[PDB]
Amino acid sequence: AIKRIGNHITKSPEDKREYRGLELANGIKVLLISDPTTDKSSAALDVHIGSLSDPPNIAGLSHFLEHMLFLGTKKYPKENEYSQFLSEHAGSSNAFTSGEHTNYYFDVSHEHLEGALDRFAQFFLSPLFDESAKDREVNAVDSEHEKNVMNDAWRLFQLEKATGNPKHPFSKFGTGNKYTLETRPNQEGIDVRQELLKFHSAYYSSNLMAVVVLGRESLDDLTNLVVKLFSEVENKNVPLPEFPEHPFQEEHLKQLYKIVPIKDIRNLYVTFPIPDLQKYYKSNPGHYLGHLIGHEGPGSLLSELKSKGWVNTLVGGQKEGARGFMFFIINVDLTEEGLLHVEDIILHMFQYIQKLRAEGPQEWVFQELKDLNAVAFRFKDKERPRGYTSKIAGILHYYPLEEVLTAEYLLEEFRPDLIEMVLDKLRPENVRVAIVSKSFEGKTDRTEEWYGTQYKQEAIPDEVIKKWQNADLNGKFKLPTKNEFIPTNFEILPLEKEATPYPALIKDTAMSKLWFKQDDKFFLPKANLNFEFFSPFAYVDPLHSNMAYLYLELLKDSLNEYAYAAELAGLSYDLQNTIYGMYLSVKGYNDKQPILLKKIIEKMATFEIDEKRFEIIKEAYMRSLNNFRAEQPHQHAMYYLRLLMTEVAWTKDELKEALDDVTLPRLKAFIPQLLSRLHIEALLHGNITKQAALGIMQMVEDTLIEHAHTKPLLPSQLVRYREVQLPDRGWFVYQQRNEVHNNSGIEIYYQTDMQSTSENMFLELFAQIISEPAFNTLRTKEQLGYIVFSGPRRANGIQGLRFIIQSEKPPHYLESRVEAFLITMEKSIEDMTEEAFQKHIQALAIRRLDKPKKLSAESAKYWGEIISQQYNFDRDNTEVAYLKTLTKEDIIKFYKEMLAVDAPRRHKVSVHVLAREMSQAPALPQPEVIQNMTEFKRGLPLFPLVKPH
Amino acid sequence: AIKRIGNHITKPEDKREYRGLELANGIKVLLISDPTTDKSSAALDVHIGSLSDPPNIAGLSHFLEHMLFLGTKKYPKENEYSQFLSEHAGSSNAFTSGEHTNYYFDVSHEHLEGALDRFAQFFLSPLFDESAKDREVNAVDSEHEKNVMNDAWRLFQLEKATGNPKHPFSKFGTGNKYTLETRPNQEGIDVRQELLKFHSAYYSSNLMAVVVLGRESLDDLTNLVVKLFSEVENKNVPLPEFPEHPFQEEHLKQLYKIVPIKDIRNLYVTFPIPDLQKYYKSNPGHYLGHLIGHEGPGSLLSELKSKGWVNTLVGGQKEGARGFMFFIINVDLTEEGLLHVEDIILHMFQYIQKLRAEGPQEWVFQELKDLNAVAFRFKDKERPRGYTSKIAGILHYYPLEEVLTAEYLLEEFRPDLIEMVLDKLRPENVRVAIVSKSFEGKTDRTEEWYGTQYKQEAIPDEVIKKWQNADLNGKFKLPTKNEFIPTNFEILPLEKEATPYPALIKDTAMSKLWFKQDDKFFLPKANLNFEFFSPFAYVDPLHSNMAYLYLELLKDSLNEYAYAAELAGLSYDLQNTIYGMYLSVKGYNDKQPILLKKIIEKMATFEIDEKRFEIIKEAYMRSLNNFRAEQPHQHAMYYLRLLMTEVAWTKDELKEALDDVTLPRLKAFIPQLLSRLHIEALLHGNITKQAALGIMQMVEDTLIEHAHTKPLLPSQLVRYREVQLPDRGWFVYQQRNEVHNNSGIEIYYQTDMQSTSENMFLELFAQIISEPAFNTLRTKEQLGYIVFSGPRRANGIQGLRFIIQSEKPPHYLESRVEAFLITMEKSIEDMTEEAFQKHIQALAIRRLDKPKKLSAESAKYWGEIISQQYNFDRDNTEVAYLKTLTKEDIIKFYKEMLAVDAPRRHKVSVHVLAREPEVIQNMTEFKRGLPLFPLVKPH
């Protein structure tokens, strides 16, 4: 079947992978990928034969064949020689099974397109399907069935397979156990391996392939390679097993089921068997419905159900199915008071159906969401070349060679008759109900045959049922508004005369401070924005910090219902409290940043509170506070760790007690006083202009002075908090007794120094040289506990070294094991060669040196300088230049006074986290107990702050 | 002439034994016997004044008393009596009045004979010599030359002369050279022979008042003075007195406009009134003085302050002669008062009509009677010198039992005398005197002797009839009986708590209570100290201004209530701190908890007025606007307390933020301010621990009752730390003054916290460089008057500071200080042991003092409360350490810490320039990255 026909393929211009689709005369869909810039070349094969295409006697045979067709060629009868040949040439093969397709996919090293594909082509001439291969593989397929017993998604998936018509060929089995695949056939005299060769030859070898090769040779050389090489496939014309009817054949309509799952969940699964729309891929009305189901907007269903407090979450939309039929599923979470009102929720579902039934289909929703799909699929980022070939081979069976990329992610036409058709489908006639909830114990008798879930009809009488049928009316539900806002203008802006590699201070006031660079590297329409809020009142009290958290909580919760569609347009955001103030980041496209950001500033600038919303947030965080009385000991240690190394820290006791007086007039009166006089600093990076950023900055500061009359701060009321000095040789400690866990925790702290260029390399390189041996020596070798950690603890511009270990040990014993490792490192200083030095410092070098892979990464790093006020933009090159400048005697000098136990500059702290009831040790100096941290920290010196770069 | 009739006089605290007696030759003698005095004393008053002079020669009795100084027949030398007082520390003094010439002196210990020998023959032989007279005429010249510009004698002689000019009240008291020896000899009068007539007949008869404060015995003193000072023999010379009031309807309803020397503004209302000296039972003129100076609800001055015309106004009885007495009213003046004079005097008439409406009052009488009972009952003491001359003044007008129990008790009530002076206090009887500087060239009627200028200026009748006819009642109502007059005068004897220092009898997270009973003084009073901490002081500069103006107007509001406390003898203090609030309560132990609880209740539930708010707001805005014009050494100490704290709101930040002060802003802040705070308490005096617990519990109970005060976490009881230095660097900056043309400078040295070593380091090294600084720097260098040095005690941290203001080159002035550094540096080892030892004894007794008041020990106890150390015998231990220093110790203290190469050189200066190391560009960016000191562990 040596035939080739292809051309240039519209390849979504961001991508550079050169394409060519063609179909071979023996029923093979072929896509030729030419990417001369890829490292790994790849190839993949999908055949339209599924786990519903199994023989009626043998279940899960196609799964067994996508295991077994790897094994055995006449050239190499060995088991993994193709797999080892790709272990030579970097190839990671895998294969999988679906209801209608069985797909194979792999890759190869750089250019090995003759070798591996010849090893893969030989499968077509001579597959072996050996005795021991089969008889161990069927145990592996039985283990695949065995691990899918307790996997609830595949258990309920097979419960979907089995609770339709048990006569319809949809009811076939997918995975295959030992017994149905290889034990019942041969005891009936059916040869399993002759079924394998029959299945392969008649069904597999005939037609319905969808192969794809990601090469980098050229278009044409791999083209006449593979069309020559894969004429070895000879047609036998298996028909496509399609289904002319849905399996819900008047036994499964208007019927209820109650299922017992493994996981303690509460869910309701409602299924509508609905006609095909694979032909209707041009408009795709079902995914348009799924766009309308789980949308959060004015008068949305989820807005109403959250407003009634019945539904935690939901999702609905088109369920893909067979060729003839498809399904329509709804997957919801339940509350306790939704559990009594599930039937009423279904009434609200019919209310939303009446909402869709009132306004009919709509054009601007379709046309604009069509445009969103258009642009976002046009400006889709990238793809991994592995998985890509399995995907496009998955959908290659269904589309002509130019429709293989804009396959369903692009919409041609408006079909209000199809939208009205599926709207007319959404009726109480078409309902199948399956409830998945754990509390159904003892009540569910009808057990699944293979996996073993248990369910029942167990219907509620017909009152509720016909009450669902008759009652088709809509209430509050309204049209969701639209947030398009020019996703066309996505083009790049070339950098100006101001050519800096770092965001520069382009605007500084006593009110503001503005850092900005536009995207040099990534060439993206997006932009990322980081924002600082300073406030005095964030760190004054438990009370005011509670007021901050509840404000930000109800604040962000309020404008979220608008924010869903805007972030659905690709504009993400964050609100987060700090000890400084609140943290705002907004990240996304250039689409609506001034507009949306303006709406944000106006929104939190003048913001109001509802009473019961305040009360629910009050109760909720009131319950969220006392959570820490049961936490993990390593967590308890990290909490006290960040507790001790700040200026003050208000406890969960004090935070929980501080909610005793928080009234809505108290907080809401406090807020404009809270917002009276602040300072804001901003980091801006991405596809924008500098002067437009200056205008956005003037916009926001003007907005703030407008609403609540924000005044600039003084740098004498702009403060940072200090870190405590040690007695320069003292090692002080205390204990905390957890209640729940019988494991004890401990964490050790070292005040080295400020981040100078020397100290960063000291602490990081030392941290890495204690990273691998300690983990190899204490958790691997000594096996102290599962929680074993080493590394840095940096606060207030001061470095540190922390170790997070929870185990069931005495903590002073465990300290002795720490000191034993300190002696081990002490000797390992002189046990380090030049090579163990140089490989390790080069490991640190590559650890430090990397360009980012997202604008958000470098924005988070530069912002990490901004929150520390550092701005040392080339700390990486400078510190690596120091890193190459270390010697061995450097680390001896770092050891003697900073790291030793007799060290005169030893600034060492540890903390015990006790349990619920709690080979060399040196002579430690005695520690003190630390009862009152206030009386402890009352007279102690303090660190400086960093002089900013 | 050995005649005596007296006994010990009912006094109780004082031990000075008293006997009054009259001698048969007409000598009234009062004997003071205090065998506990170190210095004995004596005094003589002559009740003969310049009113007994001849009308042609002025100051003749003045010149005789001047000439009675010089010369005895025993000792005819000039200053030989004065030399006997120069030997035995004796301080004599004399003066001349219209009716008195009084002498008082003392002696070293026992020296009564010497003064007798150099004083007795004054009555036998006053010499009236060549040299005595011819120098004493210059002494009279100098006497009038120093008394010419004395505004007391100027305005008083203006009172003497603006009466009847014919009456001898219009004579001149002092006399210059001109009237002494130019006017009599051109009239041919020999002064000396008149002096001999005046002393022989006139100064020998009577009206001398002898008294001796002696320690000899009852009888040694007795025959001492009675035997040898019987030399006075009666001549029955009549008393120089006036039988009429000298303001004889020439000057009534008359105004006067006086030109003063001092730039002052006053208005004077005068009533001559008959004698009520016989009626000391009710004392109606001083009872009127009680009714003038009350400032209470419905009082006149309460509305006058509410009007803004009159700042203050004193009134009451002025004494005159036996025949007449006076009634003077002295007010303060504003400018607009000069245009509203008629209405002011109308308000006076309003209050007069209120007294005429309310009639006489008995509970006011009985009340002030109780005030005289208590205040004379527990009156403390007096200076022994001058006192004896005073009661010798009281000897002429009172018998020997009434010279000591003088007016301090009230017998009977005299409503008719109240009506009598009500008839005196009438618009018909008014003399008016205006004192203003701007009436020069405007007042032609000049005073005769001194030469100030005034004017008769009869008032036109529109104002006269407005003054007469408009005597009406408006709003005013006399305030009622005060609720707190004390009866608890029973001092409590010391119980089981026999510690000499206050113990923490109660501490909670809500309250802290320290207590001691009074060991030393054993007084019915009690004094109270309280700290109320809150973190809300440093919320804003604006919130700190809120704190300030809140407590300011708060206390000022209850000040109108507090006048009864000022009337009852009960003092107090409210004061904000940068940390919190300070409450002081002082007075008797009777009714301080109930009244204090009313203070608690009132400032807990308190209201705000708008215009009082606005005024105090603008006034403190002005004071902040005025704190750009202040003293550059004080401005330097403000920079000192600025830089060496953890964080402080600046005065510009305090200044500018006051545009934001609305009444709902603070009035919303107040219950927030009163929601969570700390309470600390010191109670001291003759009281118990259990009653202190119940009273304090009552107080904090009232607090939680009104404003629901909850405690503060001890992590939210922070203090300000102090800035770490490089410990050897000397950094500096400058600030240019606006107003004053002098430059200020301060140099700072922190050693360490107050340990027992560091306190004597600081104190001893500071005082040992104090007296050579007086030797060389201030005396020799003469830089400016503001030259000061010494310690800086702040935040439980010692420091050393130097206060020098003068317009100098600042770095050269630093070099002058450096010269004094080298001076003291070499002067450490050039010091002998003697300077060392006498100096550490100087420091020792300088530091070692017994208390002198409950206030003293309470100030020391509070001085332990403010550092929270409670190191109650730091004093004794540090003194035990103080002699434990050596010369080489202070060599080490200089070299190790203070020298130029010293590693503990904590040296920093701040320049405050006149009106026109490293630099310090931004104190904020300075303090941005810097370490901080630890705090003090409380012992």
Interatomic CA distance for residues B319 and B301, integer angstroms: 25
Interatomic CA distance for residues A481 and A365, integer angstroms: 9
Q: Say how many C-beta atoms besides its own lie within 10 A of residue A499's C-beta.
A: 8
Interatomic CA distance for residues A120 and A71, integer angstroms: 10
Interatomic CA distance for residues B432 and B344, integer angstroms: 13
Interatomic CA distance for residues A410 and A10, integer angstroms: 13
Interatomic CA distance for residues A55 and A46, integer angstroms: 19
CA atoms B748, B752, B755, B761: torsion sign: negative
Query: Could you say which of B714, B932, B935 has the minimum Cβ distance to residue A722?
Result: B932
Amino acid code (one letter) for B895: K
Helix (H) or strand (E) holding A355: helix A342-359
β-pair type (A432-437, A325-333): unpaired
Interatomic CA distance for residues B454 and B452, integer angstroms: 7
Using the beta-carbon criterion (under 8 Å), do B924 and A715 form an inter-chain contact?
A: yes
Interatomic CA distance for residues B610 and B918, integer angstroms: 50
Structure-token match 């500084």, residue found: A508
Using the beta-carbon criterion (under 8 Å), do A934 and B647 form an inter-chain contact?
A: no
Contacts with A935 from chain B: Cβ below 8 Å: 714
- In chain A, breaks (C-N over 2.5 A) are found after 918
Query: What token pair was written down for A627?
Result: 């959570």
A788 is in an annotated binding site: no
For residue A462, report the phi and psi dihedrals to the nearest 5 degrees: -70, -10
Interatomic CA distance for residues A214 and A32, integer angstroms: 7
Contacts with A946 from chain B: Cβ below 8 Å: 929
Q: From residue B528, how far is each of A310, A334, B592 by CA, in Å?
A: 63, 66, 9
Interatomic CA distance for residues A28 and A1, integer angstroms: 9
Query: What token pair was written down for B443?
Result: 């007042």
The answer to whether the beta carbons of residues A909 and A749 sit under 8 Å apart is: yes
SS3 for B487?
coil
One of 3.40.50.10320, 3.30.830.10, 3.20.20.105, 3.40.605.10 is the CATH number of B503-716, namely: 3.30.830.10
Amino acid code (one letter) for A401: L
Superfamily of segment(s) A731-938: Metalloenzyme, LuxS/M16 peptidase-like (3.30.830.10)
Q: From residue A241, how far is each of A397, A894, B231 by CA, in Å?
A: 14, 73, 157
Cβ-based neighbours of A603, under 8 Å, separated by 6 or more: A558, A559
Contacts with B936 from chain A: Cβ below 8 Å: 939
Helix (H) or strand (E) holding B46: strand B41-46
Q: What angle do CA B782, B787, B790 make, to 5 degrees?
A: 140
The answer to whether the beta carbons of residues A684 and A863 sit under 8 Å apart is: no
**Distance of residue A722 Cα from the nearest chain B Cα, in angstroms:** 8
β-pair type (A258-259, A432-437): parallel
Using the beta-carbon criterion (under 8 Å), do B937 and A942 form an inter-chain contact?
A: no
- How would you class B691 by CB atoms within 10 Å of its CB: exposed for 0-12, middle for 13-18, buried for 19 or more? middle
Total length of chain B: 939
- How would you class B912 by CB atoms within 10 Å of its CB: exposed for 0-12, middle for 13-18, buried for 19 or more? buried
Q: From residue A682, how far is each of A12, A530, A532, B918 by CA, in Å?
A: 35, 6, 6, 34
Using the beta-carbon criterion (under 8 Å), do B933 and A941 form an inter-chain contact?
A: yes
Q: Say how many C-beta atoms besides its own lie within 10 A of residue B809's C-beta.
A: 10
* Nearest chain A residue (CA) to B718: A938
* Nearest chain B residue (CA) to A661: B675
List, in sequence order, every residue forming a beta bridge with A304; answer none if it has no partner: none
Helix (H) or strand (E) holding B532: strand B525-533
Cβ-based neighbours of A8, under 8 Å, separated by 6 or more: A19, A20
CA atoms B806, B809, B814, B818: torsion sign: negative
**What is the DSSP-derived secondary structure letter of residue B99?**
S
Contacts with B539 from chain A: Cβ below 8 Å: 536
Interatomic CA distance for residues A767 and A829, integer angstroms: 13
Best of A942, A945, A949 to mutate (most B CBs within 10 Å, chain B): A942
List, in sequence order, the alpha helices (H) in B528-631: 541-568, 592-604, 610-625
From the centroid of its chain, how far is CA A747?
Answer: 30
B855 is in an annotated binding site: yes
Method of determination used here? cryo-EM
Fold of A504-707: Cytochrome Bc1 Complex; Chain A, domain 1 (3.30.830)
Max intra-chain CA distance, chain A: 92
Interatomic CA distance for residues B374 and A635, integer angstroms: 71
List, in sequence order, every residue forming a beta bridge with A584; answer none if it has no partner: A531, A575
The answer to whether the beta carbons of residues B780 and B760 sit under 8 Å apart is: no
The answer to whether the beta carbons of residues B576 and B674 sit under 8 Å apart is: no
Contacts with B929 from chain A: Cβ below 8 Å: 944-947
Fold of B730-928: Cytochrome Bc1 Complex; Chain A, domain 1 (3.30.830)
Cβ of residue B661 closer than 8 Å to a chain A Cβ: no
From the centroid of its chain, how far is CA A556?
Answer: 22
The answer to whether the beta carbons of residues A94 and A105 sit under 8 Å apart is: yes
Cβ of residue A931 closer than 8 Å to a chain B Cβ: no
DSSP states of B748-780: EE---B--HHHHHHHHHHHHHTHHHIIIIIIII
Contacts with A939 from chain B: Cβ below 8 Å: 934-937
Q: From residue B722, how far is each of A381, B638, B796 by CA, in Å?
A: 56, 15, 10
- List the catalytic residues of A: 66
Q: Say how many C-beta atoms besides its own lie within 10 A of residue A869's C-beta.
A: 16
Structure-token match 């283990």, residue found: A143
Q: Resolution (in Å) of the shown entry?
A: 6.5
The answer to whether the beta carbons of residues A633 and A913 sit under 8 Å apart is: yes
One of 3.20.20.450, 3.40.50.1860, 3.30.830.10, 3.40.80.10 is the CATH number of A18-229, namely: 3.30.830.10
Strands (E), B360-457: 431-435, 445-446, 453-454
- Residue-wise burial string across B557-596, b where 16 or more C-beta atoms lie within 10 A, e elsewhere: bbeeebbbbebbbbebebebeebbbbbbbbbbbbbbbebb
Query: What token pair was written down for A124?
Result: 């077509």
From the centroid of its chain, how far is CA A780?
Answer: 30
From the centroid of its chain, how far is CA A385?
Answer: 20
What's the per-residue H, E or C state across B285-300? HHHHHHHHCCCCCCCH
> Which one, of A289, A296, A357, lies nearest residue A318 by Cα?
A289
Interatomic CA distance for residues B63 and A7, integer angstroms: 141
Helix (H) or strand (E) holding B515: strand B512-516
The answer to whether the beta carbons of residues A911 and A734 sit under 8 Å apart is: yes
Q: What angle do CA B750, B753, B755 make, to 5 degrees?
A: 125
Q: Say how many C-beta atoms besides its own lie within 10 A of residue B697's C-beta.
A: 13
- For chain A, the C-alpha Rg in angstroms (whole number) is 33
Interatomic CA distance for residues A444 and A542, integer angstroms: 50
Number of H helices, E strands in chain B: 33, 25
Q: What angle do CA B686, B687, B689 make, to 5 degrees?
A: 135
Give one word for B408, left, alpha or beta, with left for phi > 0 and alpha for psi -120 to 50.
Answer: alpha
Sheet containing A94-97, strands listed edge to edge, beginning at the edge strand earlier in sequence:
A18-24, A28-34, A209-215, A41-47, A102-108, A94-97
Cβ-based neighbours of B427, under 8 Å, separated by 6 or more: B253, B349, B464, B467, B468, B471
Amino acid code (one letter) for B270: T
Cβ of residue B535 closer than 8 Å to a chain A Cβ: yes
* Nearest chain B residue (CA) to A722: B931
SS3 for B519?
coil
From the centroid of its chain, how far is CA B108?
Answer: 29
Structure-token match 């320690």, residue found: B215
Query: What token pair was written down for B925?
Result: 């960016």
> Which one, of B398, B392, B384, B386, lies nearest residue B30 by Cα?
B392
Q: Which residues in chain A are classed under CATH 3.30.830.10?
A: 18-229, 258-384+400-470, 504-707, 731-938
Q: With a CB-CB cutoff of 8 Å, which residues 716-755 of chain A face chain B?
A: 716, 719, 722, 725
- Residue-wise burial string across B275-309, b where 16 or more C-beta atoms lie within 10 A, e elsewhere: ebbebbbbbbbbbbbbbbbbbbebbbbbbbeebeb
A–B: how many Cβ contacts below 8 A? 51
Interatomic CA distance for residues A688 and B795, integer angstroms: 53
Cβ of residue A946 closer than 8 Å to a chain B Cβ: yes
**Distance of residue B715 Cα from the nearest chain A Cα, in angstroms:** 5
Cβ of residue A715 closer than 8 Å to a chain B Cβ: yes
Q: Say how many C-beta atoms besides its own lie within 10 A of residue A631's C-beta.
A: 14
Q: From residue B25, how far is each of B47, B48, B227, B394 by CA, in Å?
A: 17, 18, 12, 20
Total length of chain A: 949
β-pair type (B27-33, B208-214): parallel
- Residue-wise burial string across A295-325, b where 16 or more C-beta atoms lie within 10 A, e elsewhere: bbbebbbbbbbbeeebbeebebbbbebbbeb
Interatomic CA distance for residues B289 and B378, integer angstroms: 23
* Nearest chain B residue (CA) to A720: B928
The answer to whether the beta carbons of residues B933 and B721 sit under 8 Å apart is: yes
> Which one, of A930, A936, A939, lies nearest residue A912 by Cα?
A930
Using the beta-carbon criterion (under 8 Å), do B535 and A540 form an inter-chain contact?
A: yes
SS3 for A68?
helix
> Which one, of A784, A779, A750, lies nearest residue A767 by Cα?
A750
First to last CA, chain A: 70
> Which one, of A604, A899, A525, lies nearest residue A729 by Cα?
A899
Cβ of residue B929 closer than 8 Å to a chain A Cβ: yes
What's the per-residue H, E or C state across A765-828? HHHHHCCHHHHHHHHCCCCCCCECCCEECCECCECCEECCEEECCCHHHHHHHHHHHHHHHHHH
The answer to whether the beta carbons of residues A533 and A680 sit under 8 Å apart is: yes
DSSP states of A642-680: HHHTSS----HHHHHHGGGS--HHHHHHHHHHHTSB-EE
Cβ of residue B939 closer than 8 Å to a chain A Cβ: no
Interatomic CA distance for residues B282 and A204, integer angstroms: 134
Interatomic CA distance for residues B212 and B111, integer angstroms: 12
> Which one, of B66, B55, B58, B54, lies nearest residue B178 by Cα?
B58
Best of B672, B712, B715 to mutate (most A CBs within 10 Å, chain A): B715
For residue A91, report the phi and psi dihedrals to the nearest 5 degrees: -85, 130
- Residue-wise burial string across A380-392, b where 16 or more C-beta atoms lie within 10 A, e elsewhere: eeeeebbebbbbb
The answer to whether the beta carbons of residues B469 and B428 sit under 8 Å apart is: no
What's the per-residue H, E or C state across A274-325? EECCCHHHHCCHHHHHHHHHCCCCCCCHHHHHHHHCCCCCEEEEEECCCCCE
SS3 for B595?
helix
Cβ of residue A492 closer than 8 Å to a chain B Cβ: no
Q: Say how many C-beta atoms besides its own lie within 10 A of residue A518's C-beta.
A: 21
Query: What token pair was written down for A451?
Result: 């996996």
DSSP states of A23-55: EETTTEEEEEEE-TT-SSEEEEEEES--TTSS-
From the centroid of its chain, how far is CA A387?
Answer: 17
Strands (E), A494-593: 504-508, 512-518, 526-534, 571-577, 582-589
For residue B933, report the phi and psi dihedrals to the nearest 5 degrees: -75, 155
Interatomic CA distance for residues A71 and A65, integer angstroms: 10
Cβ of residue A461 closer than 8 Å to a chain B Cβ: no
* Nearest chain A residue (CA) to B538: A717
Cβ-based neighbours of A743, under 8 Å, separated by 6 or more: A633, A785, A787, A806, A807, A808, A915
Query: Could you say which of B668, B931, B937 has the minimum Cβ distance to residue A941?
Result: B931
CA atoms B488, B489, B495, B500: torsion sign: positive
Structure-token match 């004494």, residue found: B319
Interatomic CA distance for residues B49 and B173, integer angstroms: 8
Structure-token match 């010196």, residue found: A941
Interatomic CA distance for residues A229 and A4, integer angstroms: 12
First to last CA, chain B: 71
Strands (E), A871-907: none
- How would you class B658 by CB atoms within 10 Å of its CB: exposed for 0-12, middle for 13-18, buried for 19 or more? middle
Q: Say how many C-beta atoms besides its own lie within 10 A of residue A542's C-beta.
A: 20
One of 3.90.1200.10, 3.30.830.10, 3.40.50.300, 3.30.2000.10 is the CATH number of A258-384+400-470, namely: 3.30.830.10
One of 3.40.50.11810, 2.170.190.11, 3.40.710.10, 3.30.830.10 is the CATH number of B17-231, namely: 3.30.830.10
Cβ-based neighbours of A298, under 8 Å, separated by 6 or more: A478, A479, A480, A481, A561
The answer to whether the beta carbons of residues A619 and A653 sit under 8 Å apart is: no
Amino acid code (one letter) for A576: Q
Interatomic CA distance for residues B644 and B664, integer angstroms: 35
Amino acid code (one letter) for B916: E
The answer to whether the beta carbons of residues A430 and A273 sit under 8 Å apart is: yes
Best of A716, A869, A943 to mutate (most B CBs within 10 Å, chain B): A716
Please tell us whether the domain made up of B257-362+413-469 is placed in CATH 3.40.50.300.
no
Contacts with B928 from chain A: Cβ below 8 Å: 715, 945
Q: What angle do CA A516, A517, A519 make, to 5 degrees?
A: 140
